[PDB]
Amino acid sequence: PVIKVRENEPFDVALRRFKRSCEKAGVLAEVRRREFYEKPTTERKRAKASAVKRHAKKLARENARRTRLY
Amino acid sequence: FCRFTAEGVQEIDYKDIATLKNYITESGKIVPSRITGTRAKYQRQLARAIKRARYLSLLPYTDRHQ
Amino acid sequence: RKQVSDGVAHIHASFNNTIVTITDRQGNALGWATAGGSGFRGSRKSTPFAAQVAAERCADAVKEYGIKNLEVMVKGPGPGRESTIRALNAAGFRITNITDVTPIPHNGCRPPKKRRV
Amino acid sequence: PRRRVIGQRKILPDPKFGSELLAKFVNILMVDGKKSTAESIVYSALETLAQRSGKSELEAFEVALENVRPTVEVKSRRVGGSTYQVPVEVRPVRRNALAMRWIVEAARKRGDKSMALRLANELSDAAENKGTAVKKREDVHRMAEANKAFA
RNA sequence: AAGGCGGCCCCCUGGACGAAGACUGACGCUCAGGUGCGAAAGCGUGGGGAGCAAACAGGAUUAGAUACCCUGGUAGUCCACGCCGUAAACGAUGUCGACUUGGAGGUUGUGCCCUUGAGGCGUGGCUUCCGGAGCUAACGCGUUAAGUCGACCGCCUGGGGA
RNA sequence: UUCUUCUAAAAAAAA
């Protein structure tokens, strides 16, 4: 994530652009993921659970879109 | 919204650096299929082409290795 | 002390401490300061304020080289990810380029086991 | 408390000078509801403070108070496993309350003959930037400075 | 087929699926005993050893701490050839075949209509979630059945002992 | 961040 400050540009917006670029490229998440060793069974179970949630929330939203609360 | 199925190209050519650069980030990483909308078969072919180019030093592995 | 106009700032921002090192464009270090060596220890030394004070100390400790321009190389995750960059800008340096240089293996060596806290 | 932030209650000002915070001072100084005795003590202390300062009693009281008012204080948070003394800025009403309380507690510890004399000596030293009240001020400031890393 | 398999290139090679036919003509399904494959740890011989890390040592926490946490660290993890043949070896659901409402996807062929752009209409293989009848002690399964049937095999008869 | 354990006897309604 290289960010070269352009002419007539504030430092704070440059820092914000660098932070945005970093979270886009995902370096913090990658290092925190590789901080400790994760067993293949654990990562498979985690990915499976993540997919279950990512599908359940969509279905839950679809059901909630029909009914009303008052 | 896959460009490769739109042009109906048989197989992705690894020497086509000009088109390949549009599917990589500034860090050199591969952009996910769910973002760029490419079909899975062409996504695999595209990945193979990008790796072949990296081996051939036509594309960077990372933005920092010098 | 041979005067140098422009330099590189390496920020080794770990979880437990942060190290700031100013150098020339060829990698020869001129001065350094750390949060752990800036009068902070334990819980205090892993905070952005301790990091900014460390950055100020390092910037003060390199005044005799007369550096004006500076490009930043940031490495590692920490609380002091950007506060040191702020303190360096506020110390009177013209930040030209900001780069993240955090090393990530391409599935290389096996990391240590997960802490059972 | 939990549900409602109560509305601030009114306090009538002192009879001799019409000041609000001086009336607050006599309220803080009073013990066992003897406001008359407390009023006599503060009036005598101010009357001798006027001589030692050469300025009016309100101005002398205020300049003495300003050297005792803090601007940051530590408050316990304990989000981590240990006590986290977080330095937080102090609002003006609480600043005045802390200053007056510190002055009163310092005067109650001095060894002079009368409370009026104790209060007068404490106010003069505070204006002169000395005493245990300003010592307490520097101590809390030093603590907030040492723990400034948490915010 | 299961265990399992993740950079790129080459050599040798197994299986699966699709569209049109042509061909042999029940040659089929299952299988006690038998044989082969079979994660990880472990064993033998010969190498290799960066990171990780049983045992072990030191430092903490604690009333104690032969542990959890920290710093090191040896077999092992890696390669070649044999041995061992065990797992929550799991879909806790043996294999093969036929029939029984549907919906939204993922992945991989293929036919037609003007591909009047990434469009529309079918028809196959694998696979995920929801659900009707029906079944089930319930939870749930629900054309990839735990529904309705047929062929064969293995297994169970109170808990502990085991 | 650490925070262990409480032996050994109960009674409950029947149109």
- Side chain identity at residue C84, one-letter code: T
- Cα separation, B10 vs D75, in Å, equals 69
C-alpha distances (whole Å) from C4 to each of C30, C64, C65, C66, C90 are: 10, 9, 6, 6, 20
Task: Dig out the tokens for A18 from the structure.
Answer: 């660098």
C-alpha distances (whole Å) from C37 to each of D68, D92, D98 are: 34, 37, 35
Task: Dig out the tokens for A70 from the structure.
Answer: 């008052």
Name the nearest CA neighbour of A33 among C80, C73, C102: C102
Give SS3 for B31.
Answer: coil
Is C108:C75 a contact under the CB 8 Å cutoff? no
Name the nearest CA neighbour of A5 among C5, C88, C78, C58: C88
Angle (nearest 5°) at CA C94 between C90 and C100: 90
Per-position DSSP letters for chain C, written without gaps between them: ----SEEEEEEEE-SS-EEEEEE-TTS-EEEEEESTTTT--TTGGGSHHHHHHHHHHHHHTTGGG---EEEEEEES--TTTTHHHHHHHHTT-EEEEEEE-----SS-SPPPPPP--
Is C79:C48 a contact under the CB 8 Å cutoff? yes
Task: Dig out the tokens for C109 from the structure.
Answer: 């060596």
Torsion angles phi and psi, residue C26, rounded to 5: -105, 0
- Cα separation, B1 vs D19, in Å, equals 76
Torsion angles phi and psi, residue B52, rounded to 5: -65, -40
- Side chain identity at residue C55, one-letter code: A
End-to-end CA distance of chain D: 24
Torsion angles phi and psi, residue D76, rounded to 5: -75, 135
C-alpha distances (whole Å) from D137 to each of A55, B27, D102, D151 are: 59, 53, 9, 21
Q: Which of C18, C44, C83 to mutate to test the interface with D (most CBs of D within 10 A)?
A: C44
Per-position DSSP letters for B17-32, written without gaps between them: HHHHGGGB-TTSPBPP
Is D134:D69 a contact under the CB 8 Å cutoff? no
Give SS3 for D75.
Answer: strand
Residue B37 CB contacts under 8 Å (≥ 6 apart), including other chains:
B1, B2
C-alpha distances (whole Å) from D125 to each of D30, D96, D101, D121 are: 22, 18, 16, 6
- Cα separation, C43 vs C16, in Å, equals 9
Solving technique: cryo-EM
Task: Dig out the tokens for D6 from the structure.
Answer: 């109560």
Number of structural domains (chain C) is 1
Q: What is the DSSP letter of B21?
A: G
Q: Report yes or no: C43 at the D interface, CB cutoff 8 Å.
A: yes
Strand order in the sheet with C94-100: A2-4, C94-100, C69-75, C6-13, C18-23, C29-34
Per-residue flag: B8 CB under 7 A of strand E? yes
Nearest residue on chain C to D148, alpha-carbon basis: C49
Per-residue flag: C117 CB under 7 A of strand F? yes
C-alpha distances (whole Å) from D92 to each of A39, B38, D99, D142 are: 56, 62, 10, 20
Is C21:C29 a contact under the CB 8 Å cutoff? yes
- Side chain identity at residue D64, one-letter code: A
Residue with tokens 């002079």: D112
- Cα separation, B14 vs B23, in Å, equals 13
Per-position DSSP letters for A1-47, written without gaps between them: -EEEPPSS--HHHHHHHHHHHHHHHT-HHHHHHSSS---HHHHHHHH
- Side chain identity at residue B58, one-letter code: L
Q: Which of C17, C49, C84 to mutate to test the interface with D (most CBs of D within 10 A)?
A: C49
- Cα separation, C47 vs A41, in Å, equals 35
Residue D151 CB contacts under 8 Å (≥ 6 apart), including other chains:
C49, D86, D87
- Does the beta-carbon distance from A1 to B29 stay under 8 Å? no
Distance of CA D1 to the CA centre of its chain: 24
- Side chain identity at residue D88, one-letter code: V
Per-residue flag: D83 CB under 7 A of strand F? no
Angle (nearest 5°) at CA C69 between A25 and B62: 25
- Cα separation, C58 vs C20, in Å, equals 7
Give SS3 for D100.
Answer: helix
- From the CB of residue A47, how many other CB atoms can be counted at a distance below 10 Å? 10
End-to-end CA distance of chain A: 49
Exposed / middle / buried, residue D132 (Cβ in 10 Å: 0-12, 13-18, 19+): middle
Is A2:C97 a contact under the CB 8 Å cutoff? yes
Distance of CA A60 to the CA centre of its chain: 21
Residue with tokens 């800025």: D89
Task: Dig out the tokens for D102 from the structure.
Answer: 């510190």
Domain encompassing residue C34? 1-117
- Cα separation, D92 vs B32, in Å, equals 55
Q: Report yes or no: B64 at the C interface, CB cutoff 8 Å.
A: yes
Report A:25-64 residues touching C (Cβ under 8 A).
25, 27-28, 30-32, 34-38
Task: Dig out the tokens for C97 from the structure.
Answer: 């380029």
- Cα separation, D103 vs D119, in Å, equals 8
Give SS3 for D71.
Answer: coil
- Cα separation, D103 vs A47, in Å, equals 63
The total number of residues written for chain C in this structure: 117
- Cα separation, D98 vs D109, in Å, equals 17
